[PDB]
Amino acid sequence: TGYDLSASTFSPDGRVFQVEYAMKAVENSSTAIGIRCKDGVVFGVEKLVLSKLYEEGSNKRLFNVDRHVGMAVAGLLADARSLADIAREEASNFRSNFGYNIPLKHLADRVAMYVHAYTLYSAVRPFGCSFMLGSYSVNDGAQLYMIDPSGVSYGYWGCAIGKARQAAKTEIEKLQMKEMTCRDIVKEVAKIIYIVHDEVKDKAFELELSWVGELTNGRHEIVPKDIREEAEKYAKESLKEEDE
Amino acid sequence: RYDSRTTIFSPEGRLYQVEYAMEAIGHAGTCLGILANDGVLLAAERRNIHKLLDEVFFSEKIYKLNEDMACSVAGITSDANVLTNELRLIAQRYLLQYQEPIPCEQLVTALCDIKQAYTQFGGKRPFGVSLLYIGWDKHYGFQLYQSDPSGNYGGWKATCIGNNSAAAVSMLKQDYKEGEMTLKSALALAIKVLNKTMDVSKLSAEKVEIATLTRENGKTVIRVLKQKEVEQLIKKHEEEEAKAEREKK
Amino acid sequence: SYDRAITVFSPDGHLFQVEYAQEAVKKGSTAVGVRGRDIVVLGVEKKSVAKLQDERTVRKICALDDNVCMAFAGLTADARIVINRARVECQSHRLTVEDPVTVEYITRYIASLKQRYTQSNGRRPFGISALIVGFDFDGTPRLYQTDPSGTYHAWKANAIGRGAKSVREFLEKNYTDEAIETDDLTIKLVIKALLEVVQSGGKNIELAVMRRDQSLKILNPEEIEKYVAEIEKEKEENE
Amino acid sequence: AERGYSFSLTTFSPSGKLVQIEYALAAVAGGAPSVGIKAANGVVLATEKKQKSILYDERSVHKVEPITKHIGLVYSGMGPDYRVLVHRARKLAQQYYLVYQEPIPTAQLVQRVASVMQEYTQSGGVRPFGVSLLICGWNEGRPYLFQSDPSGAYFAWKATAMGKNYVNGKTFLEKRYNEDLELEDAIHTAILTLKESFEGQMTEDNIEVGICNEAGFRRLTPTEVKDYLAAIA
Amino acid sequence: TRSEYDRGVNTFSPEGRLFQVEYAIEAIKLGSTAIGIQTSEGVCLAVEKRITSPLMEPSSIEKIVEIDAHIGCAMSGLIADAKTLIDKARVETQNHWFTYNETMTVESVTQAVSNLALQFGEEDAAMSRPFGVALLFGGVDEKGPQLFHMDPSGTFVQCDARAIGSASEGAQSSLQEVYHKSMTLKEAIKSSLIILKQVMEEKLNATNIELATVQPGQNFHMFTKEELEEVIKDI
Amino acid sequence: SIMSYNGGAVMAMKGKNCVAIAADRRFGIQAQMVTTDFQKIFPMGDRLYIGLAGLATDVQTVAQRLKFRLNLYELKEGRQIKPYTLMSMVANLLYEKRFGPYYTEPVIAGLDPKTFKPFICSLDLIGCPMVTDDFVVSGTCAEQMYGMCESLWEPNMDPDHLFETISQAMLNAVDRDAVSGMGVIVHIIEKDKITTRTLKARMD
Amino acid sequence: SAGFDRHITIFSPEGRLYQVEYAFKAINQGGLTSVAVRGKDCAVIVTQKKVPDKLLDSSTVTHLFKITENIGCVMTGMTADSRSQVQRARYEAANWKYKYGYEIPVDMLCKRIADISQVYTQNAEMRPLGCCMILIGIDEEQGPQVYKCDPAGYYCGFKATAAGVKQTESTSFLEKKVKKKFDWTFEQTVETAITCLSTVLSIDFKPSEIEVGVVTVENPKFRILTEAEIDAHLVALAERD
Amino acid sequence: GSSRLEGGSGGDSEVQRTMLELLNQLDGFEATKNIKVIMATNRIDILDSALLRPGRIDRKIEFPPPNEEARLDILKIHSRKMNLTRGINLRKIAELMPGASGAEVKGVCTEAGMYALRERRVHVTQEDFEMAVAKVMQKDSEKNMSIKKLWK
Amino acid sequence: RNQYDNDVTVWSPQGRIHQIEYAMEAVKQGSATVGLKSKTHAVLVALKRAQSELAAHQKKILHVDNHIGISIAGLTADARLLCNFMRQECLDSRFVFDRPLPVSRLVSLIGSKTQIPTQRYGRRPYGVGLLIAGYDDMGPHIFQTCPSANYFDCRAMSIGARSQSARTYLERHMSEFMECNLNELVKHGLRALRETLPAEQDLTTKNVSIGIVGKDLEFTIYDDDDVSPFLEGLEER
């Protein structure tokens, strides 16, 4: 082409081909989904254990950025870790500066600021990974946002990012998220992950969940072992029922 | 291709950008200078004499660098202005430091060092202006020097830069007497060479400016000849030419 | 495309642009230098100038200090810059340590300057070669030669510039202890070695002489004429 | 021409042309017409200011504006670069006033604006200013009309024009200009010079004119412009 | 295809190679050959001096130089890089003596020189290309005589006997054939001079070689003309 | 005090189409006089003089720096600096180093290049210009200098008697000044005449 | 003359900044469209909304932002660049109020944004962020004001304008309307904007597929019209047309 | 025959080899006895150095434009057959023509004759000659004045 | 390709960066090393190269703060830079907190440091693959870090050229781990390295490097004769 090199040159159409390639790169990794239930938010991700030598918990793609915010990544894991560090650092600055917990909307705005700043210049490459922030608080309800290489911060009731995003969105659309509770939306998330996961191609697979809600006292954290086991059991049973 | 930068050596060992600047000096308005035991002088042609331009500045190519020194520029206008201001600064810095006017050789050395720095450092195009300096100092009386874009300077009895420099220098070599030239004879020779080098109808008194530096009562004086004096000099020169033509007839 | 960059290597392992700087040096008027028992001499070709041009503004021999002289071959502006910096550092070293600079020290500093200018990419090498001839503070006729690549050696007599190869060969053939036994045979050898390139012998020759604990002296044109007459007489007599 | 010697502002073409500066000058030429006349008792600047539609409110952005009580400026080229230059010129005039308790001479102001242009047209990573400025001042007792170009070169013009039809404006002024003139006739001369290349009716609100006399530079009001247009018409 | 992956020292080729570093390693060859040998009695360095023309007094071709009173550095490559790295080695040895009031080990000083040579294009130090020079540090320390070889890529390795320079490949096999762990300093000198005569353009005679030795005892010593002739008599 | 260290005394008045600026000549460190030809009056132009007075180092440094910048200004402009512009220049100089000043008290006196009208002003060590229509003084014994100048000055003055007035005033002021005064130099600037005089003073 | 297109600071032989032209092309890339119109004593902005899903949060999704307590803006083009420019404008307005003590005039804020864009165009450090930003506000003296901040530093004031994909057609309709009885009521100007959008998109708007912001002399605070208010205006105007 | 090129798909090998044959004929074996050659060219710098070799070109004559004296002589030559009129100064015409080639001078004469013909005349006068000079030497200059004043 | 792999700052038109892949390939240009751990021990075993029979073998295992060691596979320059960074970070952690630095946090810092160059055109990616074997209060840890700033927590991993055979051996024998004495652990590692080595050669005390850390056992490196107690008891194919 000629205008694709560097992210500071517009193509004759007006498209930043570097950012478009960043979107393409993020739409090549393992899938992640999140849903904002009425009084909380739940994240799930289909991690791909590329080799059995890795122990459980390796390549954690559900980071926590400040106690109340969970961040599910998808794309280049190096950029994912860097963005997680930036998000933690911004949340720490906000807490120091204002003596109160950082709103998730504002945190997402700041991280979008950072991503867009990176995509602007020509001596750096656009972030090659997208992610989803989620939180719950008494004074703010439940919030979920999705950030992509271009750095947009649209709100969401739920979203899917990665290889199979359209199918995941289609499955999510047919749910009563506005009224369903955490204890069942977690099972629905596990079912959706098991439905959308491609076994014949990705071979390995692991299911990673988390949530933040009132039942957690508005503090993000990973799923307990028993809860995750029950959720994946329900997902397997639903998959068998669909197969029948 | 060994010419994309000022800091690139061709396999033959040539600075092609510097050479391009030197050649491009050929587009500058013709200037020339003559040294005489009585004094020193510069003449310079005005490239553009459109009737819609003012004469706000009483000099366009000749500048006064300090009490005892003047210089004529020939090259790009922006670089000429930059180097003129910088020369003034250098001379006045020397004056502040030592409490005596900078010798012309020293001023030329300073500005040529700066020019060479530009030719040598990084992404900066060489100063595309040649300069003719005239000055007086207690060390060598009257002096005339010529400085190139490449930061190289030489002391000349009489020389010329700009348009038709080859023809002007040829005439100066042919006609210039080594050590028996007065100011009047120098002015006549300057007008003659300018007439034979401009090649624009008659040498109009408005299409030329002349300056003369001479020591008077222990204090140097640089006078920019007025239109009246330029008219008188050109009239005398054309009278001499007519006399020569009549005698040859 | 393995060229046009000071900091790029070629398959043979060459720095082609510093090599090109040396080639640019090769396009300069010849300059010879010789060392004697108590006298060190530098000869240089003049190339002559148009009668309209003054001569005192053209310099190929410059005194870097009381006990050190420098002959030049290459680009004139680079010459001026290098000589100015060398003088500055000579005086700075005199300040730092209360002992006059040694020829080896000053030539090493000039070599370091050239090396610094050729290390980076946004700088052009000093396309010059220099001969530093001087007397150490103990008394010794030292002569070093520095190249654009920041490399300096020590010689007894060498020629740089256009006629470098031929004049070096002639010095090779006709350099001997008896040929430098006294303080006039060295000068005779210098004019002999330069005459293979210069034309007039007196009108295209400049000689500078340094004697132990004596300031530099530039030989007069009449003295050069007398010397060249002596060499001509010797040649005809030997014929 | 010398194609390879056209993307760099720090490289000399074999003939010595500064191709980027020449292209900037061409961009200046391809702009709104402007004209300046140096009357014997003042200066007048005019510039064509047609909008692209009636929507554009022709009272928000000016083209001829002051820089001091006795200096004003008009432009031909790109409006944003023009805004940058007018801001820098105002700052320079203020600095001069602070240093010397005396309004900046017009020659000095033009010199320093040209110096700013020079600063911007010497590095390989900046774009030369895509405008040419006409600066009118009333220093001392005589008027001054200067031009400043992207190349950092400036001139003292008796009367000139620039923009789309600069050649035609120059010929028209060459015909119409006499040294022993008055500002009142200079205004009409400039308006006619604009009209010569002007397209469409010359409504008072789509032409801007600024005078500079012993009373100090001043942009004429739309009512005054209407009266003058009626007078010539 | 090898024209876009070697325009910079910080560009990886498809084979995952630093072609500029490899290019500098190739540049190592242009220098004259040097051989260092370690023995229980000390270490010996011998270099083929390459006088391009007589009238060049030999005390300017510094292929062997002294690092403190207990190490000698043999050089092969660019004289400029040689000088810079030698200055670094001397400064580091003196700094370590000043700080810890001891003599730096040969391994430590070679490591310091390599640490200097490491900085290729790091915008944190200012060289921008590899130092096209290979060094052999032969010295004596508490661990007995030792010899190390450092190449432009910053890699240093111990070598009981090594050869570098133009005659590197041809001399390595000779060293391998002639090397048995136990020798004497004289035996190592004889073997090194024999190899130099084998792989030298000129006839080995007095000048055109330099020979140096570091022994557990007397400091680093440069054999003069007398000892050079004495050894050459019965190499 | 810092001023009292080197002493000094300078004064200026304007009559009719002329000005008169004078200063005393002394350089003593504290009490031991060193020389008697210390140039305390510097000409910045044809009809423009500055009478720096105060600590000798500051006087010389300010004179030299002012000459530097003023030469730059003349060469860049083409005019001769008007006295008001010179006052502004010196005020900017003095105030550019407010936090650590040049311990001197400039006194500018001259004639306008165009209208040739007399002009005089004096500044403080921080750069507070104070234009006057009658006279200014600066330096040590400024009190006695005030007294002399105000008492012996009269409007619409004439050159010769103005010189007599300045001579008498400065002579008595330096006589009553202890540290300062080993000779008085007077400069009278006319429309077409500069006169320098070396008034007799008590060499004690 | 094709190589003079990959850099922002390279002038084409004809003197054209193809990179800034491509920035305008990117302005005409977001798909959406917006219109602004000023009445006798009020200004109103209305922009097309696109929420092609029930899963997206329309509450967060928007293109209108209150730059300050008395100035509003509508964005068009790349959304990331839009938000960045909005934040820069907010910072500039707050800084202006802090430094000078009175709220930033709309023309001033527009000029500062234009200066920033021109600086980006001149210095080859960043690409000129491709968002077109339309400001509306109330000046205590001149009344309502509407301005544009195209990505080249040009900030002419307007009576009524449109930005986005259909800006040309919207401009044609708006000039047709304004050539007759330019002075409009609040309801009249809202109707003009909404009908311009409806005709140029060749469709009528449900209350959810539209956003409206308003500033009035009586209430000089940028206010977003709610679904109820916009629906009421739509139905009333459609009935009374 | 001009500066040769690296023979490839875009090289005039046939013309180059014909030029080489010409070189051989001019100077090879059996040198030519009494065959003189007068070659003519407009731009010489591009001619192959083999052609410019002395022996193939034993002399090189430049033809600079007239020095105003050659111009006066050319005017006399080409106006000899022209019904001039008294009070005419072909010298002044020559000065009015600077740096004009002989072809330009002939064109000046032709255009003066054309102007005379215009008024069914047989005359020629200073007016017609001056107008002809102005018409024939129609220099297309540059008028922006900025591209002109770039160089002080 | 040919225009999207000239620098790390440009995305190829496939959603991939080619310089990072080139670095991840260069990592496979080095000698084989492997690491693993028991319930109470972490161990690394690597094949130290010999540039020549005369020159000794270049050192392989680098001794980070006493409770941590590393095995490198890649450019000596980047390996030394990363080792110095590890040592400085561990020293700073010990200086500020009077206790050793966790291996997880150490590898996280290394990952961030190696990631930053992978974005800005100011330096090439760190061309080294690191096997970090450490012992913290939690227990023995084996981590892998690659030039692409990806780091994994591996129970038994291999890196360098010809690592597939060792990885397969570790996959087959992973069931044994967690219940093996130190001798059995080192025997497992040595068998993996024997498998990755070609048949006609073998492991000698000269060319093998071993490093062990664990409970009340600061990182210890065995080379040359030091490895004899392991090889001597090691079974033969």
Side-chain angles (χ1 to χ4, degrees), chain B residues 1 3-6 17 20-21 23-24 27 50-57 76-79 81-82 118 123-128, chain D residues 5 9-16 18 38 107 111 118 121-122 142 144 146 151-159 170 173-174 177:
Chain B
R1 216 274 306 158
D3 63 358
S4 74
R5 273 190 323 281
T6 79
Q17 282 283 316
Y20 291 0
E23 281 166 20
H27 301 175
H50 198 312
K51 66 172 272 280
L52 286 172
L53 307 169
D54 263 7
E55 318 91 351
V56 160
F57 304 140
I76 300 169
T77 303
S78 74
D79 302 357
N81 295 133
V82 167
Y118 263 60
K124 295 182 277 195
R125 64 179 174 80
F127 275 112
Chain D
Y5 314 81
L9 198 65
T10 76
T11 71
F12 272 121
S13 54
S15 65
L18 275 296
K38 174 174 162 285
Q111 266 191 8
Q118 197 282 331
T121 187
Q122 71 176 348
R142 55 158 296 182
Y144 290 91
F146 285 87
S151 65
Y154 59 110
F155 315 95
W157 278 108
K158 292 257 197 74
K170 191 74 162 279
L173 294 174
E174 174 61 292
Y177 174 84

Side-chain angles (χ1 to χ4, degrees), chain D residues 7 54-55 57 60 80-81 83-84, chain G residues 10 115 118 152-153 157 159-160:
Chain D
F7 309 85
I54 194 65
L55 276 55
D57 177 61
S60 57
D81 296 16
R83 198 167 43 266
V84 162
Chain G
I10 308 284
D115 288 358
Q118 185 279 342
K159 324 177 195 273

Side-chain angles (χ1 to χ4, degrees), chain H residues 1 31 44 52 67-68 82 88 94 96 108 115 139 145 148:
Chain H
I44 185 169
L52 297 177
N67 64 7
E68 183 277 327
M82 182 146 298
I88 192 66
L96 201 43
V108 166
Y115 283 15
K139 189 197 304 313
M145 181 75 158
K148 192 160 59 175

Side-chain angles (χ1 to χ4, degrees), chain E residues 10 41 43 61 66 92 118 132 151 162 177 188 228:
Chain E
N10 57 343
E41 285 173 14
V43 65
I61 311 90
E66 179 159 29
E92 291 314 349
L118 281 173
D151 55 332
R162 183 59 162 266
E177 298 154 7
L228 270 155

Side-chain angles (χ1 to χ4, degrees), chain E residues 57-76:
Chain E
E57 56 195 7
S59 298
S60 279
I61 311 90
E62 297 287 50
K63 282 190 76 68
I64 301 303
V65 293
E66 179 159 29
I67 309 303
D68 189 358
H70 74 306
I71 306 185
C73 182
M75 181 255 308
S76 160

Side-chain angles (χ1 to χ4, degrees), chain C residues 211-223:
Chain C
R211 289 197 167 85
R212 183 182 321 293
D213 309 330
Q214 198 146 24
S215 69
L216 185 148
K217 186 205 183 272
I218 295 173
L219 300 192
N220 315 118
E222 45 266 29
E223 271 191 311

Side-chain angles (χ1 to χ4, degrees), chain D residues 16 21-22 25 149 151 155 157 166, chain H residues 142-147 149-151:
Chain D
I21 295 189
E22 311 218 330
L25 284 170
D149 276 349
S151 65
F155 315 95
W157 278 108
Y166 64 99
Chain H
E142 190 277 331
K143 312 218 162 296
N144 197 344
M145 181 75 158
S146 194
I147 297 169
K149 270 269 212 166
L150 288 192
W151 291 78

Side-chain angles (χ1 to χ4, degrees), chain A residues 174-191:
Chain A
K174 54 169 58 44
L175 279 73
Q176 283 80 312
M177 301 145 268
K178 298 214 184 61
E179 53 271 39
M180 185 179 288
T181 192
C182 288
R183 214 71 160 151
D184 191 81
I185 196 64
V186 69
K187 319 183 179 180
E188 304 327 308
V189 175
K191 171 195 82 196

